[PDB]
Amino acid sequence: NELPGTSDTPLLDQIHGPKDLKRLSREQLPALTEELRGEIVRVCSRGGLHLASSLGAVDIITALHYVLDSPRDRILFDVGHQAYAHKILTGRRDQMADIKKEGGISGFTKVSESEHDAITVGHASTSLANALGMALARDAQGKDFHVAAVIGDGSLTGGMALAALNTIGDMGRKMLIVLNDNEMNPFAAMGVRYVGPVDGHNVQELVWLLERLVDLDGPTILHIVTTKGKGSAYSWSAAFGEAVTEWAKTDPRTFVVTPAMREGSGLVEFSRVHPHRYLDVGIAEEVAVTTAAGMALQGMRPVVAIYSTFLQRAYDQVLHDVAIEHLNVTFCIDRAGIVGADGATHNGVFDLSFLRSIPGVRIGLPKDAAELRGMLKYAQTHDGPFAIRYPRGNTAQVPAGTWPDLKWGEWERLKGGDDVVILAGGKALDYALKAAEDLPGVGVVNARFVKPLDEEMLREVGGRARALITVEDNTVVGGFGGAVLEALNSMNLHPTVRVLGIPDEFQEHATAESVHARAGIDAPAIRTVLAELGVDVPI
Amino acid sequence: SDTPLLDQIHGPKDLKRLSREQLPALTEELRGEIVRVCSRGGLHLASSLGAVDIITALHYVLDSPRDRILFDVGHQAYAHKILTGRRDQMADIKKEGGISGFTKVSESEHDAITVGHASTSLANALGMALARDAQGKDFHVAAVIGDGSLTGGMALAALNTIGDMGRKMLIVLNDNEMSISENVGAMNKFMRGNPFAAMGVRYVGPVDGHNVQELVWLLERLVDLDGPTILHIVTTWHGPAKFDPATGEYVPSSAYSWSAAFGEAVTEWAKTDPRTFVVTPAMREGSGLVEFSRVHPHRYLDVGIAEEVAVTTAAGMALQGMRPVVAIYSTFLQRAYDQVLHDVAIEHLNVTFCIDRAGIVGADGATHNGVFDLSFLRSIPGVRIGLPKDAAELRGMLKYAQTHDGPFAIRYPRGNTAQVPAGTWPDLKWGEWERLKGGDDVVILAGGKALDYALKAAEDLPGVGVVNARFVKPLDEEMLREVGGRARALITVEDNTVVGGFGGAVLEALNSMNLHPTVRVLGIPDEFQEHATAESVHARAGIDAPAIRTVLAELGVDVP
Ligand SMILES: Cc1ncc(C[n+]2csc(CCOP(=O)(O)OP(=O)(O)O)c2C)c(N)n1
Ligand SMILES: Cc1ncc(C[n+]2csc(CCOP(=O)(O)OP(=O)(O)O)c2C)c(N)n1
Ligand SMILES: [Ca+2]
Ligand SMILES: [Ca+2]
Ligand SMILES: [Ca+2]
Ligand SMILES: [Ca+2]
Ligand SMILES: [Ca+2]
Ligand SMILES: [Ca+2]
Ligand SMILES: [Mg+2]
Ligand SMILES: [Mg+2]
Ligand SMILES: [Mg+2]
Ligand SMILES: [Mg+2]
Ligand SMILES: [Mg+2]
């Protein structure tokens, strides 16, 4: 029990779980609220994080955990970036300094981290459907516990949230939805008792109101209003932002669509220079891709700027709405491969697998900003869809007016050697060049095209090499290694091949470097495979 | 002639020569035309008959193809094709080399979008409106969307974006689920709890969707107005062999659809497993769940046409200790890719996917061919994939999936399989293949529909082995190693794309074992397959028994 001061927390020191929180009287909850605010700011500041959303949520989370009995009652957080107060109140206060770090805890709720985490989230708008499943399962088991979902105003505009709300209406089952609105319809929300708006920062009035709502029949939306945040490095994103901004100046058919990730995708400058050629469709990736398809049908050259992990939401839209009529949609896919800190919900290691199987979708991996420019120019000037994927990370700035002629599907040899040849693009290529550096028999090819592959160069290298190594910042299942084995098979070439990539296992929050070392795709791990294939490494 | 007005109409220009007072007679001609020419090929006419009046009205008022008319799904657009120069092609609808059952951009300048999957019209319409405004043009964009499609995730999300952008366009909501009075009453209840004004959309109606003259007068007022507008309209044998309409030839009378085999299995299973719960995205009859829904009413959930909701709802049930089954077509499962990966697979949840219409479905074409699931499911960590040869293996796989940890997918085609007795619950080790025919010269690896081709192809060829590759994830590593070491050549056959499918799984597995047999990967090529019979598509793809026999002959097997 330390002295009163600027950063004492007498109440939190006694709270190890929600049961300890219930020992407080309602009148004490405003003081806890301020302790939680102080705790979040003083620990979760460095690295930015989703501090602003968690701060906005402190009072509704305190009230929910005071009124409800987690883990018997299920509190579901949409996305989960707003649940830092939830983790402090559920035995993880001492782990907040390590949030998103290897050996720490997730930046989102994760079922396997705590019995208090009802869903594993990261992708937005899943809380309502999960909530429905838990309510239906509860009713089937004759149990009586409460299901409460906390969803932001942004998340509630997602297709699967609105579709789920409609169903929650039709089903008429007991559940509470807290709409957490920090910005201040009849086809989605019929059958749903609406309550509010109400002050989202009044922890006593929220405890009062929840004790009323929690026991009512059928589904309730509680509309709360919250204040957001109450209390050398040249990125691939920037390289893209600069290339497309430059491109649009001399292509009036170019239109850039983002699903509400303008700053992430590096389109701040693009939004200000070309406001007439910029569309933020909101959070819905499915709307972004089908809208781009409508634009391409009317003679435009749309570019969808989207994270690899988020493009998963639009798989059927790419296949059905773009690929069937071979439409002019270019996909500039950021956060390609392991993103690291954000963990298994955000690691973009599936795009080379799910896009490859779609007829007519070309796939490029640029090694640098000049190749990115070459691919974007090709994509925007040739028929049908193209995907260009690049990681979170940096690359050399490139001079204005850099627009090389790149023949799509052509690989390039970057290092001499015929005994063993490493085939790799993007981040994997930099690993390959490093791994090969002192080995004269070890060739390196920039496999900068996954679809189509360079069949001629693969035939030449496949016919002479004692062994090939494939390296990809993607799952080894049906990805770049699979494409290479399928192309070798159809040529009836049978060289030794080592397929290096992410294993068929979800990768938890850590640095990309850690995931890459344990996956065995980094330069040291490639150097180990070369030795295993009988390459004489220098002493 | 029974159709004197229609006889002079070869396009929307001809339609506009009629006085409004002649339009009612024209809608009666169009209804009689659709019944006269499309009463076969198991075509459902209800949707297209219900839409005759609005489609006549839209073509009379708008200027197609300058004005863009977008049909959601496209199954309601028969009158559209009749009014846009395709009257004499309607006899060949869904037939190989005939017109599509849906609108298709390549078929006609009057078909604004290629559709089949629901709920895509609004986002496509937004795109066309935004391109129109960028180009300084002023043509009309109209989307026609059913009440069912409108409650789809991408439709509800699109309408939010449409409201925010405030761009000029007309959404026609074709509601055949509720009357005008039922709709008004529901809306009165809700806003007592304009509501569309905050969303940024003008709501007009509901009005009578069968009054072609009143629809014309109302549209003429709406097409001028700024911003997005919703017009809510309201519309109305005991012998040993039997002919199967679906497959277009004779089958044993003991043969029923895979759908019926699944419905019978899950209905029986749920009697002794109280944790089993079936979830369908509004395909009760298609997935064979009529009987299930009647016998187990409190273990049956229809979520409407929201595949993403069906999968994530099942995840919630699994997290609460239940054993949910998602009954879903392969093609519609594509909508739930992220939900399978993110909501089911990351925490390895107890969701069983029973996937109907797996492989080529035929008549419904490129938008419906379930030819990608062995590729897209396989790259998801922890998702097991089984291909049952018969109703017994389907039961063994469903029992395995419902009693073991994590997600399982069971995929089966449109088509028939032998009826099997109640209480058929074999014990099957997930991941174990079965040798069905001896031979070590050339071995065919195949599951499900491909397996039937393989066994037919290998008849009276003594050196040709056949393995039931009834598991795609995991593969049978032990049996593939043995066959891959001993066989001169392998043939893989899959009712799936050759890209990243079963053939790919086999080549990945052989590579990690450092085995180098000759392998012929047979399957659907990396190209969309247009409407035709499955048998026609399979013959041209090279996966039927004669195509397999030709590959065996090329590999130097003695084939009669
Ligand atoms: C499928 C998906 N697409 C995009 C994102 C990126 N994203 C993370 S937070 C968020 C939600 C928008 O804000 P809101 O739900 O209102 O939450 P707030 O931060 O305002 O509390 C978005 C777009 C995501 N998590 N999931
Ligand atoms: C994405 C998708 N999921 C499922 C289906 C299957 N399906 C075909 S039409 C339909 C019903 C659509 O209802 P509505 O739009 O009201 O049209 P109506 O049946 O009344 O003509 C369904 C579920 C589909 N076509 N697309
Ligand atoms: Ca689609
Ligand atoms: Ca193009
Ligand atoms: Ca290069
Ligand atoms: Ca050689
Ligand atoms: Ca309709
Ligand atoms: Ca299971
Ligand atoms: Mg103090
Ligand atoms: Mg918000
Ligand atoms: Mg893991
Ligand atoms: Mg309907
Ligand atoms: Mg084709």
Closest-lying ligand to the alpha carbon of B280? 2
CATH for A148: 3.40.50.970
Do B307 and B388 fall within a single domain? Answer: yes
Do residue B444 and residue B311 come from a single domain?
A: no
Which residues precede gaps in chain A, with C-N > 2.5 A? 184, 231
Same domain? B409 vs B442: no
Contact A125, A160 (CB under 8 A): yes
Q: Does the Cβ of A107 fall within 6 Å of ligand 1?
A: no
Helix H or strand E encompassing B230: strand B228-234
Nearest CB neighbour to A489, from listed B116, B378, B521: B521
DSSP-derived secondary structure letter, A28: G
Half-sphere exposure of A376 (CA within 13 A, CB side): 30
Say if B281 falls within a structural domain: yes
Domain contains B245: no
Residue B67 in tokens: 């004005």
- Determine the distance from the C-alpha atom of residue A361 to the mean position of all C-alpha atoms in its chain, rounded to a whole number: 22
How many angstroms separate the Cα of B437 from the Cα of each of A248, A253, B460, B487? 62, 59, 11, 14
State how beta strands A467-475 and A442-446 pair.
Answer: unpaired
Quote the tokens at residue B74: 């496209």
Peptide bond into B206 cis (omega under 30): yes
Size of interface A-B (CB pairs under 8 A): 331
Same domain, B342 and B291: yes
Tell whether B248 is covered by a domain. Answer: no
Residue of B nearest to A344 (CA): B346
8 A C-beta contact, residue A193 and residue A221: yes
The three-state secondary structure class of B207 is strand
* H-helix segments, A191-235: 203-213
Q: Using alpha carbons, list the distances in angstroms from residue A117 to A70, A113, A512.
A: 9, 7, 25
Q: Is the dihedral of CA A37, A38, A43, A47 positive or negative?
A: positive
What span, in angstroms and rounded, lies between the C-alpha atoms of B354 and B398? 8
Closest CA to A30 of A63, A53, A65, A56: A63
Name the amino acid, one letter, at A320: H
d(C-alpha B212, C-alpha A453), whole Å: 55
Instruction: Inform me whether the C-beta atom of residue B518 falls under 8 Å from chain A C-beta atoms.
Output: yes
Are A279 and A364 members of one domain? yes
From first CA to last CA, the distance across chain B in angstroms is: 57
What does the block give as tokens for B337?
């890719």
Summary count for chain B: helices (H), strands (E) = 22, 21
Ligand 2 atom closest to the Cα of residue B304 is: 23
* Cα A332 to Cα A63, A316, B248, distances in angstroms: 42, 18, 46
Enclosing H/E stretch for B148: helix B147-150
Backbone angles phi, psi at A394, to 5 degrees: -120, 165
| Whether the CB of A100 sits within 6 Å of ligand 1 | no
How far does A34 lie from chain B, in Å, by closest CA?
A: 34
- Asked if A387 and A364 touch (Cβ cutoff 8 Å), the reply is yes
Same domain, B414 and B541: no
- Which token pair is B320? 């609460």
Which of A196, A225, A254 is the last residue before a domain boundary?
A225
Last residue of a domain, one of A156, A190, A225: A225
The answer to whether the beta carbons of residues A526 and A472 sit under 8 Å apart is no
Residue recorded with tokens 């720490």: A104
Residue B166 touches partner A, C-beta closer than 8 Å: no
Using CA atoms, how far apart are residues B73 and B56, in angstroms rounded to an integer? 18
B504 and chain A: CB distance < 8 Å anywhere? yes
Burial of B540 (0-12, 13-18, 19+ CB in 10 A): middle
Burial per residue of A88-107, b for 16 or more beta-carbon CB atoms within 10 angstroms, e otherwise = bbbbbbebbeebbeeebbbb
Range of the structural domain that residue B102 is part of = 6-234
* Residues forming a β-bridge with B325: B278, B352
> Is residue B280 domain-shared with residue B408, that is, in the same domain?
yes
In a domain, B408, yes or no: yes
Contact B307, B326 (CB under 8 A): no
CA distance B351 to B402: 8
Cβ contacts of A137 on chain B, cutoff 8 Å: 277, 316-317, 319-322
Residue B349 near residue B315, CB atoms below 8 Å: yes
Q: Based on the fold, state whether residues A60 and A189 are members of the same structural domain.
A: yes
**Alpha carbon of B473 to those of A233, B294, B353, B354: distances in Å?**
42, 34, 14, 15
Tokens of B306: 């929201």
- The tokens of B163 are what? 């409201």
Cα A444 from Cα A421, distance rounded (Å) = 6
Helix (H) or strand (E) holding A391: none
- Of B48, B71, B149, B280, the residue with max ligand 2 atoms within 8 A of its CB, to mutate for a pocket test, comes to B149
Q: Estimate the share of chain B in helix, then strand, then coil, as percent rounded to the nearest 5.
A: 40, 20, 40
Whether B342 and B462 share a structural domain? no
What DSSP string describes A295-333?
Answer: HHHTT-EEEEEEEHHHHGGGHHIIIIIIITTT---EEEE
Interface test with B, best of A279, A322, A485 (most B CBs within 10 A): A485
Place of tokens 């037939």: B95
Q: B400 and B535 share a domain?
A: no
CA distance B215 to B219: 6
DSSP, res A538: -
Same domain, A65 and A167: yes
- Enclosing H/E stretch for A497: strand A496-502
Q: How far apart are CA B117 and CA B120, in angstroms?
A: 7
Could you tell me if B291 and B320 are in contact, meaning their C-beta atoms sit under 8 angstroms apart? no
How many domains, chain B?
3
Is B24 inside any structural domain? yes
Closest residue by Cα to residue A454 from A468, A441, A440: A468
SS (H, E, C) B66-131: CCEEEECCCCCCHHHHHHCCCHHHHHHCCCCCCCCCCCCCCCCCCCCCCCCCCCCHHHHHHHHHHH
**Phi, psi dihedrals of residue A413, rounded to the nearest 5°:** -75, 125
A81 is in an annotated binding site: yes
Length of chain A: 539
CB-based contact, A188 to chain B, within 8 Å? yes
Q: Is residue A2, in this structure, part of any structural domain at all? A: no
Contacts of A74 in chain B (CB under 8 A): 320
- How many angstroms is it from A347 CA to the middle of ligand 5? 26
Cβ-based neighbour number of residue B221 at 10 Å: 10
Distance from CA of B249 to the nearest CA of A (A): 30
Q: How many CB atoms lie within 10 A of CB B558?
A: 10
Same domain, B414 and B440: no
Ligand 2 in reach of B28 Cβ (< 6 A): no
CA distances from A386 to A84, A255, A445, B38, B297 (A): 39, 15, 22, 39, 47
Distance CA A118, CA B439 (A): 53
Q: Which of A225, A260, A279 is the last residue of a domain?
A: A225
Assess contact for B56 and B83: CB atoms under 8 A. Answer: yes
DSSP calls for B473-530: ES--HHHHHHHHHH-SEEEEEEEEESSSSHHHHHHHHHHHTT---EEEEEEE-SS---
Is A193–B193 a contact, with Cβ atoms under 8 angstroms apart?
yes
Integer Cα distance of A538 and B469 in angstroms: 46
Residues of B in contact with A497 (CB under 8 A): 511
From residue A415, alpha-carbon distances to A429, A449, A465, A539, B457 in Å are 11, 17, 14, 21, 48
Give the residue among B379, B308, B417, B30 at the shortest CA–CA distance from A358. Answer: B379
In the DSSP assignment, the letter for residue B464 is E
The answer to whether the CB of B443 falls within 8 A of the CB of B465 is yes
Could you tell me if residue A60 is inside a domain?
A: yes
Ramachandran region, residue B195 (left: φ > 0; alpha: ψ -120 to 50; beta: rest): alpha
B461 located within any domain: yes
User: What b/e sequence results for A213-250 when a residue is b if at least 16 CB atoms lie within 10 Å of its CB, and e otherwise?
Assistant: bbeeeebbbbbbbbeeebeeeebbbbbbbbbbbbbbee
DSSP string over A452-468: S--HHHHHHHHHH-SEE
For the Cβ of B305 lying below 6 angstroms from any atom of ligand 2, the answer is yes
Quick check: bond before A18 cis, omega within 30?
no
Per the omega criterion (within 30 degrees of 0), is the bond before B65 cis? yes
Q: How was this structure determined?
A: X-ray
Residues 6+ apart with CB under 8 A from A283: A124, A125, A154, A155, A157, A158, A259, A260
Would the CB atoms of B113 and A476 count as touching at under 8 Å? Answer: no
Between B502-512 and B477-486, two packed helices, what is the crossing angle to 10 degrees? 80
How many angstroms is the resolution?
A: 2.1
